[PDB]
């Protein structure tokens, strides 16, 4: 995933992971 502002910090860091939650 992706966010449209690196300001949004939450949709940010759901991007950050990967499987290993």
């Given at each position: 995933c992706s966010c449209?502002?690196?300001m949004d910090?939450?949709?940010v860091y759901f991007?950050?992971?990967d499987?290993?939650?």
């Open positions: 449209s502002s690196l910090k939450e949709c991007c950050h992971l499987i290993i939650w």
